[PDB]
Scaffold this active site. Sequence first.
Site, PDB file in Angstrom:
ATOM      1  CG  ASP A  92       3.813 -72.566  25.375  1.00 13.54           C
ATOM      2  OD1 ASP A  92       4.389 -72.547  24.254  1.00 13.54           O
ATOM      3  OD2 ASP A  92       2.619 -72.944  25.525  1.00 13.54           O
ATOM      4  CG  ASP A 264       5.995 -65.695  23.253  1.00 10.71           C
ATOM      5  OD1 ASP A 264       4.818 -66.069  23.062  1.00 10.71           O
ATOM      6  OD2 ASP A 264       6.974 -66.378  22.885  1.00 10.71           O
ATOM      7  CB  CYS A 302      17.426 -46.413  21.628  1.00 11.82           C
ATOM      8  SG  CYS A 302      17.241 -47.658  22.911  1.00 11.82           S
ATOM      9  CB  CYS A 304      18.174 -48.790  26.191  1.00 10.50           C
ATOM     10  SG  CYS A 304      19.651 -49.278  25.247  1.00 10.50           S
ATOM     11  CB  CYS A 307      21.293 -46.115  23.187  1.00  5.43           C
ATOM     12  SG  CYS A 307      21.037 -47.475  22.045  1.00  5.43           S
ATOM     13  CG  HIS A 333      19.601 -51.642  21.729  1.00  4.13           C
ATOM     14  ND1 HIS A 333      19.213 -50.320  21.716  1.00  4.13           N
ATOM     15  CD2 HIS A 333      19.258 -52.151  20.524  1.00  4.13           C
ATOM     16  CE1 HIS A 333      18.687 -50.034  20.537  1.00  4.13           C
ATOM     17  NE2 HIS A 333      18.708 -51.126  19.795  1.00  4.13           N
TER      18      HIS A 333
HETATM   19  N1  LIG Z   1       1.362 -74.256  23.354  1.00  6.45           N
HETATM   20  C1  LIG Z   1       1.616 -73.629  22.220  1.00  6.45           C
HETATM   21  N2  LIG Z   1       2.722 -72.874  22.088  1.00  6.45           N
HETATM   22  C2  LIG Z   1       3.030 -72.228  20.880  1.00  6.45           C
HETATM   23  C3  LIG Z   1       4.247 -71.562  20.738  1.00  6.45           C
HETATM   24  C4  LIG Z   1       4.609 -71.050  19.488  1.00  6.45           C
HETATM   25  N3  LIG Z   1       5.793 -70.453  19.053  1.00  6.45           N
HETATM   26  C5  LIG Z   1       5.592 -70.225  17.769  1.00  6.45           C
HETATM   27  N4  LIG Z   1       6.476 -69.724  16.903  1.00  6.45           N
HETATM   28  C6  LIG Z   1       7.845 -69.374  17.253  1.00  6.45           C
HETATM   29  C7  LIG Z   1       8.716 -70.584  17.525  1.00  6.45           C
HETATM   30  N5  LIG Z   1      10.120 -70.216  17.917  1.00  6.45           N
HETATM   31  C8  LIG Z   1      10.875 -69.594  16.788  1.00  6.45           C
HETATM   32  C9  LIG Z   1      12.264 -69.217  17.247  1.00  6.45           C
HETATM   33  O1  LIG Z   1      12.973 -70.350  17.749  1.00  6.45           O
HETATM   34  C10 LIG Z   1      12.279 -70.915  18.857  1.00  6.45           C
HETATM   35  C11 LIG Z   1      10.894 -71.370  18.464  1.00  6.45           C
HETATM   36  N6  LIG Z   1       4.370 -70.608  17.335  1.00  6.45           N
HETATM   37  C12 LIG Z   1       3.722 -71.163  18.418  1.00  6.45           C
HETATM   38  C13 LIG Z   1       2.507 -71.799  18.567  1.00  6.45           C
HETATM   39  C14 LIG Z   1       2.150 -72.350  19.791  1.00  6.45           C
HETATM   40  C15 LIG Z   1       0.942 -73.169  19.941  1.00  6.45           C
HETATM   41  O2  LIG Z   1       0.110 -73.311  19.053  1.00  6.45           O
HETATM   42  N7  LIG Z   1       0.778 -73.759  21.173  1.00  6.45           N
HETATM   43 ZN   LIG Z   2      19.296 -48.674  23.073  1.00  6.34          ZN
END
Ligand SMILES: Nc1nc2cc3[nH]c(NCCN4CCOCC4)nc3cc2c(=O)[nH]1
Ligand SMILES: [Zn+2]
EC number: 2.4.2.29
Lengths: 367, 367
Positions: A92, A264, A302, A304, A307, A333
């Site tokens: 990212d 992710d 599962c 894994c 398990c 897991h």
């Molecule tokens: N560059 C870029 N990266 C993104 C990453 C994102 N992550 C999320 N949502 C989940 C955020 N997590 C939740 C759990 O704790 C850590 C942060 N929403 C996200 C949106 C973006 C985005 O619009 N741009």
């Molecule tokens: Zn498992």
Amino acid sequence: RPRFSFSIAAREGKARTGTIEMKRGVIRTPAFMPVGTAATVKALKPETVRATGADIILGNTYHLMLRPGAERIAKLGGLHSFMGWDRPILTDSGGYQVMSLSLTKQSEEGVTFKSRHMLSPERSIEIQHLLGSDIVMAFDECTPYPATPSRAASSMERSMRWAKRSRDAFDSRKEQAENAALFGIQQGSVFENLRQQSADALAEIGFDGYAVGGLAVGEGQDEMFRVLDFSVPMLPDDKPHYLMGTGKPDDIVGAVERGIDMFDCVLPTRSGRNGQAFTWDGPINIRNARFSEDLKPLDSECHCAVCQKWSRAYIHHLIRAGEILGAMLMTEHNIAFYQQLMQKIRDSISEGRFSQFAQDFRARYFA
Amino acid sequence: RPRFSFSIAAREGKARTGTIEMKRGVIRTPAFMPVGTAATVKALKPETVRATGADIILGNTYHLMLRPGAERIAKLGGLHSFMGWDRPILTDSGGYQVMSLSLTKQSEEGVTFKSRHMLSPERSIEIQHLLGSDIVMAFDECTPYPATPSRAASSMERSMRWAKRSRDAFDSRKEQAENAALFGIQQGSVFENLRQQSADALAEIGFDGYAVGGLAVGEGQDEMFRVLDFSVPMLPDDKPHYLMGTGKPDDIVGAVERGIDMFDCVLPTRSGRNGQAFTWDGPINIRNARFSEDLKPLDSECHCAVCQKWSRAYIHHLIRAGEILGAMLMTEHNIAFYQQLMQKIRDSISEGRFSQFAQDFRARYFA
Ligand SMILES: Nc1nc2cc3[nH]c(NCCN4CCOCC4)nc3cc2c(=O)[nH]1
Ligand SMILES: [Zn+2]
Ligand SMILES: Nc1nc2cc3[nH]c(NCCN4CCOCC4)nc3cc2c(=O)[nH]1
Ligand SMILES: [Zn+2]
């Protein structure tokens, strides 16, 4: 293998399954990417991450530039060598911390974080080059939720200008352009017309893949799904679609139903360390006293290694005692479970029975 | 394999090397036993503990009776099944917490700890049966250091009475007597005449092995060695000699020179998590800034999986970041190092060059 090639092998409605070929390996889609923010997937060796079925993992520009440093990682031979993962890594761009750590002075030039650090389209791209990421994300701004139409539009317009700057930065770096791929990120909040403008802008620039940004920021599943409904069809069909920050298993399933290829989330790792274990009958909290003498594995089906060998009772004890092996076993897991979920999704799409799988999965998971 | 058989294959001066055969496996001596106090060797799967070369691990009556409970572990099929280690386990009797957690009311009957818990020769033996330990330690009192001759004598005399009670408890339990072994523990502080009385008392009762207790309690290496000099020859030559709570690599080497066969200590695991890594040129602290860009492995000769794959620089980053993989990697290496130390000791004794090895080891380790 090529720099980047996405091939779709089967479809069912909007859902599809196929492969991304890159120099460091093949990624099966729909894919789940374990999160490795501090150059480690928490509590797992890379061999273990691979053994669970992961094809690719996620790294982060923002965190790695702070610690241990982008230039340092480059001097040490790159992120793959550093952490011992030789398959693809998606990074990212730091765009999400531009919003979550808003510590921040923002301008058309980029973002200054406060020691003080700067991020911009050009610096983000350079850092991801230094890390040696295989899939580079454009530097964007994740619009806060909720946002007015005017503020969502202004933010999205800046992101599209930054998307062009990211494209140009990436292309001016010969070794990066020839060996890595670059994804653009759609913004526009929950507004259809702005999502359309963003998709048009990104397609005009041209990217290897397209992420749906700006979601999983508190909007709830109904609204996320509503936005995906009109947003994903706006993106080029012949390129991968990545939903950033999603998510819970039901979110993944519904998102694949709406055309998403890549996912992710920290949920399996983080909540794993906190004692939540995913099962086909829904999540359980292994800390609960009802598991203190339960000889069954975390999940009855599962496959894994966890398990295969250890009981709920043992893992319950480890997590209650704050033992590191507790975090290790829960995390292995949970990641294995997510990969089994993706595998069942890929297979059901290949066999044209994904609709039924979605229905069966939900009936049991939410019983 | 037999219930218990100790065979000595080679000697050099007081040092010896050989094997202990038990039903669950063979133990090569001199042996190092990783410590698994909370039914886990911290931050390691049992497969990993075995891969480092460990033949046996150490568990603890006191800690396991508190959490998760001795009866509970028995209902779950025993400690081996519970934690997934199928080789021998030695359990300490709780005698050392009788001193370190002195919370305590002591009497000829035993010790009450405060919820309130009781330990006695009979209860300790029963708990170790419930756990299914292969090597059972007699319930003793580790005399505090320093101790006057009078107090050391009183304490040692109580321990010898408790040793007899432990023997009888063990023998009255048919399944335990037929499948496990029982070690007696010598006391008497630093006083030769009392060590002699204790050895005589233990030998009259008769045990499968004999531990030197009451050391590694702040007396320093010179004094420990001085006591071992006259104490170990007091014990039956044809049975294993176990030095409880030792120790640093130099302590192990000098102790083997003085006739000790078995060792345990938390040093490789605990100090591993704190950033200390053992090398043939002495310990290093991986947190130190000088390792931030060091591409070498933790140790240049070490054959462990950690040193095969990851750099000092990476492990430095993990430990500084408080990452669990940091603890995992440091601990695996440190335990592997201790096992390589024991292997080099066994081989040098077998080849009649242990004296030279001791000399070479120290010259390099303390350069
Ligand atoms: N560059 C870029 N990266 C993104 C990453 C994102 N992550 C999320 N949502 C989940 C955020 N997590 C939740 C759990 O704790 C850590 C942060 N929403 C996200 C949106 C973006 C985005 O619009 N741009
Ligand atoms: Zn498992
Ligand atoms: N039953 C019994 N167990 C013993 C265990 C011993 N351990 C030690 N020394 C090391 C103590 N560690 C030092 C590191 O922190 C944990 C405690 N010295 C020990 C002595 C005995 C003993 O005399 N009897
Ligand atoms: Zn090593």
